[PDB]
Design a protein around this ligand. Structure first.
Ligand SMILES: *[C@@H]1O[C@H](CO)[C@@H](O[C@@H]2O[C@H](CO)[C@@H](O[C@@H]3O[C@H](CO[C@H]4O[C@H](CO)[C@@H](O)[C@H](O)[C@@H]4O)[C@@H](O)[C@H](O[C@H]4O[C@H](CO)[C@@H](O)[C@H](O)[C@@H]4O[C@H]4O[C@H](CO)[C@@H](O)[C@H](O)[C@@H]4O[C@H]4O[C@H](CO)[C@@H](O)[C@H](O)[C@@H]4O)[C@@H]3O)[C@H](O)[C@H]2NC(C)=O)[C@H](O)[C@H]1NC(C)=O
Ligand SMILES: *[C@@H]1O[C@H](CO)[C@@H](O[C@@H]2O[C@H](CO)[C@@H](O[C@@H]3O[C@H](CO[C@H]4O[C@H](CO)[C@@H](O)[C@H](O)[C@@H]4O)[C@@H](O)[C@H](O[C@H]4O[C@H](CO)[C@@H](O)[C@H](O)[C@@H]4O[C@H]4O[C@H](CO)[C@@H](O)[C@H](O)[C@@H]4O[C@H]4O[C@H](CO)[C@@H](O)[C@H](O)[C@@H]4O)[C@@H]3O)[C@H](O)[C@H]2NC(C)=O)[C@H](O)[C@H]1NC(C)=O
Ligand SMILES: *[C@@H]1O[C@H](CO)[C@@H](O[C@@H]2O[C@H](CO)[C@@H](O[C@@H]3O[C@H](CO[C@H]4O[C@H](CO)[C@@H](O)[C@H](O)[C@@H]4O)[C@@H](O)[C@H](O[C@H]4O[C@H](CO)[C@@H](O)[C@H](O)[C@@H]4O[C@H]4O[C@H](CO)[C@@H](O)[C@H](O)[C@@H]4O[C@H]4O[C@H](CO)[C@@H](O)[C@H](O)[C@@H]4O)[C@@H]3O)[C@H](O)[C@H]2NC(C)=O)[C@H](O)[C@H]1NC(C)=O
Ligand SMILES: *[C@@H]1O[C@H](CO)[C@@H](O[C@@H]2O[C@H](CO)[C@@H](O[C@@H]3O[C@H](CO[C@H]4O[C@H](CO)[C@@H](O)[C@H](O)[C@@H]4O)[C@@H](O)[C@H](O[C@H]4O[C@H](CO)[C@@H](O)[C@H](O)[C@@H]4O[C@H]4O[C@H](CO)[C@@H](O)[C@H](O)[C@@H]4O[C@H]4O[C@H](CO)[C@@H](O)[C@H](O)[C@@H]4O)[C@@H]3O)[C@H](O)[C@H]2NC(C)=O)[C@H](O)[C@H]1NC(C)=O
Ligand SMILES: *[C@@H]1O[C@H](CO)[C@@H](O[C@@H]2O[C@H](CO)[C@@H](O)[C@H](O)[C@H]2NC(C)=O)[C@H](O)[C@H]1NC(C)=O
Ligand SMILES: *[C@@H]1O[C@H](CO)[C@@H](O[C@@H]2O[C@H](CO)[C@@H](O)[C@H](O)[C@H]2NC(C)=O)[C@H](O)[C@H]1NC(C)=O
Ligand SMILES: CCC(CC)[C@H](NC(C)=O)[C@@H]1[C@H](O)[C@@H](C(=O)O)C[C@H]1NC(=N)N
Ligand SMILES: CCC(CC)[C@H](NC(C)=O)[C@@H]1[C@H](O)[C@@H](C(=O)O)C[C@H]1NC(=N)N
Ligand SMILES: CCC(CC)[C@H](NC(C)=O)[C@@H]1[C@H](O)[C@@H](C(=O)O)C[C@H]1NC(=N)N
Ligand SMILES: CCC(CC)[C@H](NC(C)=O)[C@@H]1[C@H](O)[C@@H](C(=O)O)C[C@H]1NC(=N)N
Ligand SMILES: [Ca+2]
Ligand SMILES: [Ca+2]
Ligand SMILES: [Ca+2]
Ligand SMILES: [Ca+2]
Ligand SMILES: [Ca+2]
Lengths: 388, 388, 388, 388
């Protein structure tokens, strides 16, 4: 195998088709399904799999009580076959920790898991399923990373990390790994003022990451990385179609180089595909909670501060719970272009559904089509009442 | 691997021997077995597997309530090892949707799943376990397909779809795929007046499909496809041995080019092997409900409108529930001929057994023998009373 | 791969060491373990596995009620990893039926399963996991076979079948298969008067089978097969150490060419290794029930009608339940000789333990050592009281 | 594949990073997890796995009652994927017995399991998953071995066994195996007065084992083996930092060639890495019970009888239960040095938590880092109250 190179551009996105859905919470009501959160999808050259942060207990287990908590010693990055649920018996542990990223470089996979107390966390970088490099916290305040796949080009796999306050200036770093080793790292540059949980994809030797400004911005920060030069830039999506959550109502003009104000100290992981007129943004339908999910075609959203939608697709109705969302692509597919894909985490339980004592999720994921396909909505589908 | 070619003829069918049986409902009374319906069997060059449409819940799970419903967002085409039950832990998701077909072309497998609301469904064609082509609804009324395996010849795998009313004229199309891409498609031609759920097999470079006329006919429509010319014909099985269900009592003369009347707007997926004197038809024993199942040798059934049985084999007694049935063959077996095989879906639960709130099934499947073997009957075997 | 040839002799048996044990009934009290009976062990060139006739239900399942019954449509030959229990999720179905045999010829495996009603059963011979040949009942009275592995030599795998009364003269046949096809078959010859459930092994191009005379004999019938000439002989173990069950007390002189009398119309599958002074016989300790199990070294047992034990090893105490037993060897091991192995079925439930409504078993298996090792006893280990 | 040779030295240990954790007891509260004890970790050239002695029952099963007992016929050495829990469905049985060791030589794996009554136990040595050699008890008093991985060099895999009293002089032997066969064996020599459960690792063609003096010493005995010469030496860790348990408080001068007194007839399996200034010792935090676990850097601990700690890392708090601990390394990793690793058994249930009737454990394991990483504590995490 040779390292994969990002030689293709994105396929034209005219609509989104169903790719995978695990129905985990439904199935887990009567089977040994692990409690998770922070899911994602990532492909190897011969298979694509679902990934997530386990909570080290089944949903029906008594240890499901208290799983709203984010960082415990019982969490691990697990992967499992596409569209099956994350069960005790089919889940493969990639590494131990409560924050992660993972990507295949064409030869083998790199997985990164961070663990530890808030003031003393460390990342362990695994490559070819063995630990290779370790990075200690630099700001002693919840060292943390993407929560979705990283992207590689000719062996170089950039990864975005943040350490420091989630509600003020923090220390974000872009690490350039190759075979699990650090080639270089750089501090964040550009006009993004705060970075969290970047969702990335690659095309034509450029990696684009759409992140979460948890401090002040309801528009999303964007980091664009050149994996050959090992350099990057940052800005915000200019469009007035705001895609974080919670967020204020959409204005008619956005902000390119500063956080769009109105909501502080909160957000949700999200993503976008920024490709000139072939630009599609995801977002929750609700401006107040993680409810609903839609894709909007917003030509030149990255650079046009008045850009509005020209087409759309509802993924999850506003009467259904959503959650994190992120990008991934099958870089080893046939054809002349890379097909954009995304997943949506469907969060169930606390804090929105507090009759149960747990927090978990299921996954739904779609990929683009060049056809203009009919739309459906894809809820988690479980009935909370059954778990009482 | 090279694409498989249909170079052999059918083996002589003198009787049927047991091939596989999963006992899913029995086992599922106390194990994590998924609720399914619309099962089938399909072989790869190195393995044969069971397939079905999951309902995204176990049978003992509380989400089993309401599984009589046909089309939900929680369904998926799953496959699992021959004769094991479809469990949460061994079921491999092929694609997401509530109508499907799947077949191996000798190099890799094509799987097709349709999803969406009734007026806006779409098919996604997967090839080598990746999405390749998408087809939007053309008649905005439950785009749908075979519910059993497709057949390939030199890479070309024809698939029959229907979109439109299930109880009147509809728009049936024959698509010719190769490597998941559309080479051609044609509207139904010939004298079949309505087509549903075709069951197909191939021999000597011809593909024969036996379908369900849900509108007016109790005789079954037959589509014969030339996968090299990418052309087809259609008619009805001429024989007076009527094989749909429900159906009127058998007459002494059938109809070759029109629906045999007596029962409207209902039917059941079924199949036949039409090979001159080596012709065998399957059918439910009951004319009123999906009860019992038998194979009848009816020489020249396709073309002889007075043809009657010369031999038979009971598969499922009339005091046991049956359901859908369809054809498949192991195209990669040794020997000089293709051995005809079929499965029968054994439906349990609603609507016939309404003391439980679910609907599921188990599978029984047989293949032909050149011997004249003794017969047994093969019920699902589960006791409904145990699930109360 | 080339077909395996029986070029080695047996290793010297000085004692028996533990080889595998699945503890199925213990584990199955709280996990999805299938109800079985008629277990055995068989090796492939790269793995050795446990085999058995499933009853198509878990032990805790409500369908476990009535599993004392021998022949139902819900049975199948299943195999699973050595020493794991036969679970719903790890059991691989080899074929459907209620009587079986299976063996690897060095290239691939042949498995045979018989199914059907008592007066119309048929065997299906599978080879390379595909059905190849079928054999209809010849005496219309429970066509049936070994219940333990068959043995191959240069592709030829002889199999012993019986059809007819279990309590009087019956029609026993020796079939010689190669690649799942019938090369030849012969009626039983020699002085054995009734044959059931033969346990076989091979060494130096000769296959020796120790069987169960269910009609009149408490000594065991022996069939010796030449797989090159495709011919055989039969007699009884001459020794006065009687090894069927139930049986009369041991005399001082046995019978070589006729059934040793005292007990009619009953027996148990068993085995022996007959190799001059290196001869070891297995038997239940009790003369009245399937309780206890011991190995006795009885030099020249086959040909010496006064032969008595010179050494022994207790396998299962007389206060613990035993059951069927049979031979197998790893023909693909390293070294200069074939190591004799055997399994003992540990039957639990009915009819001896009738507080539960099921019948199942676990497995214990040993192989010979050239050392004189200390002995232990190996009970099933489950507490019946827990299942109440 | 060629046999692995110990050509590298240990990497510099500046801290320990999380490697694996299965959370077995937490998950097992509501899933089919086997009861175990005596766990360890061992790598093959392409995978690293968790190992342990099963008790042949699930934790929630009724057969969990009485699992404080050490030696039953229902135990087996099982292995399972790194960081998953030992479940009924994913656990692979390596051999049957209640004491074990296992190691890969670069070509295939050797596993050794001992079974039998106290006065008549025997070891069976498996190689390439087949039984090859057997060793009968030599002192008729619980023949027993390491309970953690063995180490190989150019095919030679030394293994330490003990037979005789656990509370007085016993007969310890060092066996040198190659391809499962005995090349040589030697009686213990040197100044160690009693040896139990050695934890070993290899570097630069030398194998170092840290053991448990169950008779008189609270300092640990050390055996150093030359696998080429097939010779060894023994002594005690000279340091006053005492690492057995229970144990007296630390003195200021230890003992190099005799047991450090104060506590008799008890101990716990443990380990160390003895590499000049790069020396790290593990131990329970409590001097009285198996509670807590810490790593201490004690330069020249092996040879300096006044050596004290210069650095440390807490692994398990003193308010959490610990248990056995042992060494392993991935000998097939990339790079120029071998990364030291260890596991800690987290024992739950009896005798410390007697509200439940079982005894089981979970696993936590770490490997060294050349960075100075922040520390966290890693408890088992299960709530006993949930199992009541
Ligand atoms: C069969 O399936 C097909 C294919 O899916 C179906 O066809 C699809 O139908 C969709 C629904 O109508 C349609 O999606 C919409 O597309 C609009 C763009 O098209 C229109 O404008 C362009 C440009 O002028 C024209 O060329 C075009 O012809 C159309 O006229 C989007 O604008 C739509 O999104 C907006 O509306 C929805 C509500 O429906 C919001 O949820 C969404 O966020 C957008 O509106 C908010 O945002 C904008 C931008 O700032 C604001 O201006 C606006 O006021 C809204 O703001 C409020 O709401 C947001 C969200 O809560 C909040 O943040 C904010 O603060 C405010 O409170 C929508 O995307 C598909 O394009 C169409 N596809 C095709 C191929 O045709 C077909 O219907 C199906 N058939 C049947 C029979 O069912
Ligand atoms: C051991 O096993 C062996 C092997 O299996 C057993 O032998 C098998 O025995 C079977 C049962 O007898 C037998 O199957 C029958 O074969 C008949 C054909 O053979 C006869 O006719 C030919 C032609 O003349 C002769 O050459 C031959 O020698 C025989 O005489 C079929 O005709 C049979 O099917 C009909 O009967 C059954 C009821 O038994 C129906 O279920 C079936 O649908 C057929 O009848 C309906 O349909 C016809 C056609 O239209 C009508 O004319 C008729 O009135 C019936 O219609 C009503 O019912 C249907 C169904 O509900 C409904 O739709 C309709 O409207 C009406 O209400 C049957 O297939 C096997 O061939 C034979 N095999 C061999 C190799 O011998 C042996 O018995 C076993 N031994 C023991 C001891 O058990
Ligand atoms: C550590 O482990 C080692 C290794 O396992 C242990 O050593 C083993 O000890 C075993 C038990 O003593 C021993 O097994 C016995 O071997 C006898 C043969 O040896 C003796 O005879 C020879 C020949 O003369 C001498 O060379 C030799 O030195 C000995 O003296 C067998 O004869 C024994 O079997 C008979 O006894 C047992 C009861 O213990 C029966 O269950 C068994 O069926 C045999 O007896 C029945 O059958 C014979 C034959 O027909 C009859 O003559 C007799 O009356 C019995 O018949 C009744 O019972 C049967 C069964 O229910 C019934 O069908 C019938 O109708 C009648 O009712 C036994 O096999 C091992 O060989 C020995 N191994 C070694 C290597 O030393 C050591 O003890 C262990 N240490 C500790 C401390 O525990
Ligand atoms: C972020 O994470 C980083 C990295 O982990 C954290 O930094 C780590 O902090 C650790 C805790 O302070 C520290 O570990 C200690 O290291 C000591 C060695 O360093 C000191 O001495 C050297 C040599 O002079 C100096 O160079 C150095 O600068 C330091 O001054 C060890 O000595 C420590 O172990 C002893 O203490 C602990 C209690 O904390 C005991 O559990 C342990 O067993 C040791 O003490 C017992 O044993 C000794 C030896 O015999 C006795 O002398 C002593 O009296 C104790 O004996 C009693 O207790 C034992 C155990 O129960 C019993 O058997 C006996 O009988 C007696 O009853 C300890 O290992 C790390 O090295 C340090 N790492 C780095 C890289 O800095 C940082 O804090 C974290 N940050 C935050 C904000 O949390
Ligand atoms: C990705 O690009 C690099 C070139 O920059 C390719 O690397 C060369 O691969 C060939 C085949 O192994 C070698 O002969 C060269 O030495 C490689 N290295 C470089 C840096 O030139 C790589 O093959 C490309 N990947 C694919 C899948 O084509
Ligand atoms: C078992 O014996 C037969 C010989 O009787 C061996 O068969 C020969 O195998 C070689 C290698 O494939 C061929 O060249 C010959 O044509 C084979 N056939 C015969 C009948 O001669 C077979 O190889 C032996 N098996 C092993 C494992 O050695
Ligand atoms: C405190 C910083 C947060 C991100 C801005 C926080 N990340 C971590 C590593 O704890 C996330 C946030 O609290 C949760 C959410 O917003 O859903 C998930 C939670 N993420 C994870 N548990 N992995
Ligand atoms: C409305 C058209 C019907 C076929 C003629 C219908 N097909 C679909 C895709 O819904 C089937 C029919 O209603 C059910 C049955 O007859 O058993 C199954 C049902 N099929 C599926 N749920 N896959
Ligand atoms: C009626 C003939 C019997 C053998 C002599 C009978 N065999 C079959 C195929 O039914 C066996 C016997 O009744 C049972 C036993 O003895 O344990 C098992 C039972 N064997 C199986 N169920 N496979
Ligand atoms: C009697 C000798 C003991 C070791 C010094 C004893 N070993 C065996 C083989 O029984 C261990 C000891 O009793 C237990 C413990 O200390 O935790 C485990 C127990 N070990 C195992 N059950 N494998
Ligand atoms: Ca924000
Ligand atoms: Ca359960
Ligand atoms: Ca009809
Ligand atoms: Ca008898
Ligand atoms: Ca001690």
């Amino acid at each position: 195998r040779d390292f994969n190179n990002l030689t293709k551009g994105l396929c034209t996105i005219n609509s989104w088709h169903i790719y995978g859905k695990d129905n985990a919470v439904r199935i887990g009501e009567d089977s040994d399904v692990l409690v998770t959160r922070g899911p994602y999808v990532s492909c190897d050259p011969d298979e694509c799999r679902f990934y997530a942060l386990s909570q080290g207990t089944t949903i029906r287990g008594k240890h499901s009580n208290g799983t709203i908590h984010d960082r415990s010693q019982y969490r691990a990055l697990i992967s499992w076959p596409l569209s099956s649920p994350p069960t005790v018996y089919n889940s493969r542990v990639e590494c131990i920790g409560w924050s992660s990223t993972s990507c295949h470089d064409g030869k083998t996979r790199m997985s990164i898991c961070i663990s530890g107390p808030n003031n003393n966390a460390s990342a362990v970088i695994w490559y070819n399923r063995r630990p290779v490099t370790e990075i200690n916290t630099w700001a002693r305040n919840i060292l943390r990373t993407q929560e979705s796949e990283c992207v590689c080009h000719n062996g170089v796999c950039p990864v975005v990390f943040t350490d420091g306050s989630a509600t003020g200036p923090a220390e974000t770093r872009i690490y350039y790994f190759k075979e699990g080793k650090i080639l270089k790292w750089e501090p964040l540059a550009g006009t993004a003022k705060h970075i969290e949980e970047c969702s990335c994809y690659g095309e034509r030797a450029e990696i684009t990451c759409t992140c979460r400004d948890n401090w002040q911005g309801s528009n999303r920060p964007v980091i664009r990385i050149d994996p050959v030069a090992m350099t990057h830039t940052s800005q915000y999506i200019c469009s007035p179609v705001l895609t974080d959550n919670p967020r204020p109502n959409d204005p008619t003009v956005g902000k390119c180089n500063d956080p769009y104000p109105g909501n502080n100290n909160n957000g949700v992981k999200g993503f976008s595909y920024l490709d000139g007129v072939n630009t599609w943004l995801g977002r929750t339908i609700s401006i107040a909670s993680r409810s609903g999910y839609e894709m909007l075609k917003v030509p030149n959203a990255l650079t046009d501060d008045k850009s509005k939608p020209t087409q759309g697709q509802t993924i999850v109705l506003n009467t259904d719970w959503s959650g994190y969302s992120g990008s991934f692509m099958d870089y080893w597919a046939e054809g002349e272009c890379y097909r954009a894909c995304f997943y949506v985490e469907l969060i169930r339980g606390r804090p929105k559904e507090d009759k149960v004592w747990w927090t978990s999720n299921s996954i739904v994921s779609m990929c683009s089509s060049t056809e203009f396909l009919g739309q459906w909505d894809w809820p988690d589908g479980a009935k909370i009442e059954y778990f009482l």
